[PDB]
Symmetry: C5
Subunit: 69 residues, 5 copies
Amino acid sequence: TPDCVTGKVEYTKYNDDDTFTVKVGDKELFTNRANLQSLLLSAQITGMTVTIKTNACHNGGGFSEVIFR
Amino acid sequence: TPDCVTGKVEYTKYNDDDTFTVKVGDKELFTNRANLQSLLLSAQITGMTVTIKTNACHNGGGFSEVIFR
Amino acid sequence: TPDCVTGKVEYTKYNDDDTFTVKVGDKELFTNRANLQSLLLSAQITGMTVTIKTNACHNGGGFSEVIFR
Amino acid sequence: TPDCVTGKVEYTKYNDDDTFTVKVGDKELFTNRANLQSLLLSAQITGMTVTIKTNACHNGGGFSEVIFR
Amino acid sequence: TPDCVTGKVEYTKYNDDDTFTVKVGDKELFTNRANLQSLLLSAQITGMTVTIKTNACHNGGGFSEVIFR
């Protein structure tokens, strides 16, 4: 799966349908994997660099692969 | 969903019916989404700014959308 | 539900029947709500003030309402 | 249940059968309670003193009661 | 099970099939044990030394035993 965006997490958002949105760089992407919620919030809290990999690389696109650095 | 309140978490409360109350600004709101409990406690512990979005924007109102900054 | 005790957590204890004991002030109380286990350990780790509300306000009393400050 | 060992956690180990081993003092003990895994890792990360209570107080013994201080 | 690699976690990766990859030393290994995801991310965040034990000691090998130091 191609890299879509790499950077620090600007904000995260818990959505009404229980998906989780993350803003990295200039993209706002969402995931429906519940396990990723606290992992992404910890990446945000500790200033990690995340690389989100997704084919839906556009605002509102979904993802399920993340590298935490 | 309209923004209801933005600020640092003043306190959180685990309720008898397993819902979770959060006080931000001047509003005391609650959520019944279990996944939000440790996310909101981490936001409190690390001094994050949260924006709670809800139509029930009054004390005792329920919510399910939160932005963590 | 009346306030029972307010203070910093002195210690927590995982019990054999999977309940969780917390000592605050001079009271040793327990809860059977699994969700409260890591929330109370985080309150302990970060020096939060907790207020336990319970009618069973005596050693060995059970509780399910907590304010984290 | 008698106290078996008190001290800081020297290391923890995730085992193939999903049990979790902890070394405190001179004893290597294990637990099969999934809830204790992240609680014990947090106790290790923050230098807490833990008291493991168990009748099987010997290397390889199992436990389910822990005091976190 | 033989030791495969010991060192600090260079990065972790959440995979599309919900397995979790970790890079330690020169090996990239994965686990399918969901419980290990946040334990390994905490080990990464706090600079722990981990020893991964596995017979599949090669890139892309799977593991289920980890010592956290």
